[PDB]
Amino acid sequence: MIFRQLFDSESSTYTYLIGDEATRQAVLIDPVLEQVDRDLQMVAELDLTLTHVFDTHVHADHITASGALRERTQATVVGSVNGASCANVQVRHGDEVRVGQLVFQVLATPGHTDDSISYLLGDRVFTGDALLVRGNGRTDFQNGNASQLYDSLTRVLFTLPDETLVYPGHDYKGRTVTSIAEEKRHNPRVAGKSREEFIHIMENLNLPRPKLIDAAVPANRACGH
Amino acid sequence: MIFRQLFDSESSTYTYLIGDEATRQAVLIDPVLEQVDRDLQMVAELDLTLTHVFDTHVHADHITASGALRERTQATVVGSVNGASCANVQVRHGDEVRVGQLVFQVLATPGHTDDSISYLLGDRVFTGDALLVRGNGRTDFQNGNASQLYDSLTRVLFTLPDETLVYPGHDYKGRTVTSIAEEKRHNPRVAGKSREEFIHIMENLNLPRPKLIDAAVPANRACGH
Ligand SMILES: [Fe+3]
Ligand SMILES: [Fe+3]
Numbered sequence: 001m002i003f004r005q006l007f008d009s010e011s012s013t014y015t016y017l018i019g020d021e022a023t024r025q026a027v028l029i030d031p032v033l034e035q036v037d038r039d040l041q042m043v044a045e046l047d048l049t050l051t052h053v054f055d056t057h058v059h060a061d062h063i064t065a066s067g068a069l070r071e072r073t074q075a076t077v078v079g080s081v082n083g084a085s086c087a088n089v090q091v092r093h094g095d096e097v098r099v100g101q102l103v104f105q106v107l108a109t110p111g112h113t114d115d116s117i118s119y120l121l122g123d124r125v126f127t128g129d130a131l132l133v134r135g136n137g138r139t140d141f142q143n144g145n146a147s148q149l150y151d152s153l154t155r156v157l158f159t160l161p162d163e164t165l166v167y168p169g170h171d172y173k174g175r176t177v178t179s180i181a182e183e184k185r186h187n188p189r190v191a192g193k194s195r196e197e198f199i200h201i202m203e204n205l206n207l208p209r210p211k212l213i214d215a216a217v218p219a220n221r222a223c224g225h
Numbered sequence: 226m227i228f229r230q231l232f233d234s235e236s237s238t239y240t241y242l243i244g245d246e247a248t249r250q251a252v253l254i255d256p257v258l259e260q261v262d263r264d265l266q267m268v269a270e271l272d273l274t275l276t277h278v279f280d281t282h283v284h285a286d287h288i289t290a291s292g293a294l295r296e297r298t299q300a301t302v303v304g305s306v307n308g309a310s311c312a313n314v315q316v317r318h319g320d321e322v323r324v325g326q327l328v329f330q331v332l333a334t335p336g337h338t339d340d341s342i343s344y345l346l347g348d349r350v351f352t353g354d355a356l357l358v359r360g361n362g363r364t365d366f367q368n369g370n371a372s373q374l375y376d377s378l379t380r381v382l383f384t385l386p387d388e389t390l391v392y393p394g395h396d397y398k399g400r401t402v403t404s405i406a407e408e409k410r411h412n413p414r415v416a417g418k419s420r421e422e423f424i425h426i427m428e429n430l431n432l433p434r435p436k437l438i439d440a441a442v443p444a445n446r447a448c449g450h
Contacts (some may be wrong), residue, residue: 003328003404004399004401005401005402006399006400007232007400007401008233008399009399019243035399038398038399038400042400045407045410045411046407122429166359174231174232174233174260174263175231175232175261175267176229176230176231176232176401177229182271186270187269188441
């Protein structure tokens with residue numbers, strides 16, 4: 001497996017490039033529109049071919065590049081059934097997405113948004129804004145739900161093996177990766193917290209409205225158009 | 226081996242945490258003073274003990290945390306013989322630094338600075354500002370020399386195995402890692418460039434002086450004191 005983590009300073013978004021060493025097929029997870037040239041340049045120079053693009057959820061902080069990438073490489077766009085309608089492959093819990101020899105298992109992890117999903121790839125999982133490094137995404141927009149996010153964290157993600165690496169969709173403090181074992185112990189909002197305790201925290205976070213939410217959400221519904 | 230890459234947005238500096246699974250000894254490479262609490266919290270939560278702190282070179286963009294870390298954990302500060310005098314272990318080309326059962330081989334890679342070195346750990350090398358992702362550090366300050374840097378890249382670093390991962394001290398475009406094979410083929414300043422060609426490029430880069438060099442350099446020669 002060929003693995004590359006990409007960072008977009010503007011939105012603090014993590015883009016993930018996973019390549020299959022057999023078929024040389026590559027997939028970009030949560031790519032950013034402004035970073036299209038960077039991403040494609042990395043794919044080519046690593047001697048891979050972009051055949052898939054995954055979106056963990058409809059983003060409100062950046063414009064997805066899935067649409068722009070599909071125009072350039074004819075890659076398959078994958079998303080939640082509750083996500084962008086123009087996505088070629090719409091997946092739900094239990095589904096699998098084949099990227100060459102790579103088999104991604106789809107995990108439904110709503111809470112941040114109702115269309116939020118996670119991609120399990122063996123020893124690692126890409127969780128988007130559901131599970132972050134020592135935190136989690138907000139639940140006050142995009143039909144978010146604190147109670148639902150608690151289920152996605154404790155029952156869906158935390159049941160994964162301890163050594164499983166967690167690659168989040170964002171980080172604002174310079175952390176690049178965490179693990180399930182780490183979060184089951186040191187997550188300030190979930191570890192030692194009940195559902196009601198977790199709900200009370202999220203409902204009273206008092207955070208400013210997402211900067212690009214009124215622009216990004218409609219655009220990302222159309223795969224960034 | 227426990228590996229964690231940390232990013233400091235203010236200086237675009239990459240800090241590297243390498244932990245030994247056997248002895249639980251950990252080392253921080255190029256730690257940032259403003260990120261001391263973050264770094265130590267990561268070391269503890271990963272069940273490790275900071276015993277060593279490496280610095281690739283005297284930095285001109287941020288204050289090193291080696292001194293402050295030495296105050297808290299009594300960690301061994303390692304640096305070049307031309308680096309900070311208050312460093313406990315001063316190394317040169319050919320030397321080895323052992324962090325538990327981890328064996329770091331020291332590679333002398335001047336050019337950016339006269340005290341710039343690289344740490345080889347098996348399948349990966351930490352190059353500081355000598356070799357960057359699709360680039361290299363500037364050679365017009367703190368005893369920098371384009372001729373030396375060309376030699377450090379082509380004769381010292383590029384002779385390492387192709388599959389060797391390269392973890393740079395900085396990146397300003399969101400790239401986290403490259404490899405020797407990639408840079409031998411796609412480095413815009415060295416690939417297909419002679420020594421004289423490379424020198425003339427660096428001689429006329431026309432860059433603004435690092436707006437911290439007058440504060441950071443003398444401070445980092447005192448290990449961030
Ligand atoms: Fe989000
Ligand atoms: Fe430097």
